[PDB]
Design a protein around this ligand. Structure first.
Ligand SMILES: [Mg+2]
Ligand SMILES: [Mg+2]
Ligand SMILES: [Mg+2]
Lengths: 253, 251, 248
């Protein structure tokens, strides 16, 4: 029937709000039959969860800046570089391995930027091999420097041994060419002691705090403590040179 | 004060101020998610429909290559209906299909059965590639009846999913090929008739979007074709299902 | 007359124009998709096991199909069928549990059923299936797991997956020739049969969320009590227990 025009609209929708089943069912049925709405809602959902995830990772990077930029981690590039690229990787991660040539290109193309190496184990069974590889790398880094650590790092990848195929025997076999016999013997005795190399414990604790457990990733950020969320980028271990380069420029700007 | 008809005035207002009724329906959907399940199954059904319609079109577009006189076949050259099969010898479903395809051939003697050697496993297991090359070589040098014997005999090994060895293939291939004809396909070449056949089969499968095996195309050989006589089954199926497809293709 | 009830009756009769603006609203406010999945998860917590077992038995040929990726013996006594959608960045991490289960059960078969739930980007699901299918076919089950875990790890840090994300990861798992052929099929719009088959099975199993599990012996047996259906994320002991029942 009929009623005051100014009251119909507001009253009709307030009634549906109070008693939603009848209009909820009829519209839901309409939507089940024109389900194209699902395709657009799902796109909006994932587009917004991506942004929300990134924002939350950026907050974590700002909170753990000191740990991320620790001078205890092997790095190349200047210690006071304006931008840092922090890399969480497992030597037995097969796509981290395939990313190594891209990272090497980034490093050559950005001699002014600090690249920090966070070795960690994706799975529990990798702890003996990851820990051993971190022991060797730390010895190489501490006695011969960052560029030489990077040779060792690339050489370990170049075995092509990934996803369980890299053994302690393999690491030792390569490591005899980078360590003195005395260093090598000291690494073997530490590994056999049951102790877990401190960098592996620290890196895994940091990965868990960063919500990177089991997941390789890059953090690109200015080193000087600035709360500018706009200069930080958190990127999956699988990425491109262009994407990492843009993050570097954003971290320098 | 201005007055109007409740029904349409309310509808026009909701349309221009959708948010509050929008929230009600969002909540209704969250608490009655069977409607989103229904919506998702309808999108799935639309996908199935468009997939089968596109398959049928692809079969008509690539008819000449699907029915090529160059591929191994048994049954009448100009049978009213054709059955085209893509397979790898170590595909477990293709192996289980083997006796089904034998029955169908015995049951349909005026239908053309076309064999598209499609060894999708040959990178994983090179014996899959060797077996396809031997099959081609038996067709090229011995004809369709001998090809079929070879083809059924090889599946009779029961050796699938990596277990098929060179010795399995060579032992059986000696009964169909001379030492020289067999020696010529022990390794793949970059040209030659066997290479050209396997390559065109591969490009055909890609044109059909047969990314796995087995795959079946049933269709009239005549160019004048009703889409309702064309059946494309891109996985394993039952004998009854192929037999009905053959009846439809017969007209 | 009373505005509320007759206004409601009129929309019930003539739902289309309200449906259209609500459809536009739902696309802009997609929170309801997440809440709907929680409600589906709750119903499944109290879903009845005997009725899931009967479903699993009805679809045993599809569940155990050799055409889906798997590890462990083809002729294993027991199979674990895992249904999953790559695009749940907020779901629980199952990779560590499944890695442990495969180690602890070297003589059990683990099968992988990727599919799209109602809230995922279906073209991305399709591209992920086409890549995994090539990896499975050309390199086998262990490599398929490699790829599978890599994609979950990528989606976790990214927070979502686009086709570009899948392509960027896929170049490390397929040759350029294989990847070009996948990209050709994907961008032509062809509907991937393996994904459509997986989705049809998931729907028939009432698995409307990710993940979900069917544990069963591979030999067709009369015992329904050797079958376990776990329609959600779960722990290693729960699945270990289902494996034990399937193996006896
Ligand atoms: Mg050296
Ligand atoms: Mg006949
Ligand atoms: Mg076992």
């Amino acid at each position: 029937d009929s009623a005051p025009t100014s009251q119909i609209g507001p009253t009709a929708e307030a009634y549906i709000v109070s008693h939603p089943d009848k209009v909820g069912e009829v519209v839901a049925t309409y939507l089940a039959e024109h389900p194209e709405f699902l395709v657009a809602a799902s796109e909006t959902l994932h587009q917004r969860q991506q942004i929300a995830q990134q924002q939350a990772y950026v907050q974590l990077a700002l909170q753990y800046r000191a740990e991320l930029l620790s001078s205890s981690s092997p790095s190349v590039g200047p210690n006071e570089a304006k931008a840092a690229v922090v890399m969480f990787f497992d030597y037995q991660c097969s796509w981290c391995s395939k990313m190594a040539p891209v990272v090497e290109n980034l490093i050559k193309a950005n001699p002014d930027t600090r690249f920090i190496f966070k070795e960690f184990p994706i799975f529990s069974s990798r702890w003996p091999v990851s820990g051993l590889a971190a022991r060797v790398g730390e010895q190489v880094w501490l006695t011969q420097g960052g560029a030489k650590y990077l040779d060792w790092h690339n050489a370990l990848y170049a075995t092509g041994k990934v996803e369980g195929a890299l053994t302690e025997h393999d690491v030792y076999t390569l490591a005899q060419h980078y360590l003195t016999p005395t260093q090598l013997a000291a690494v073997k005795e530490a590994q056999s002691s049951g102790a877990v190399h401190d960098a592996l414990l620290t890196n895994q604790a940091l990965a868990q705090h960063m919500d990177f457990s089991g997941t390789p990733a890059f953090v690109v950020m200015p080193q000087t403590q600035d709360g500018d969320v706009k200069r930080v980028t958190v990127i999956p271990g699988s990425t491109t040179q262009d994407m990492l380069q843009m993050a570097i420029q954003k971290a320098k700007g």
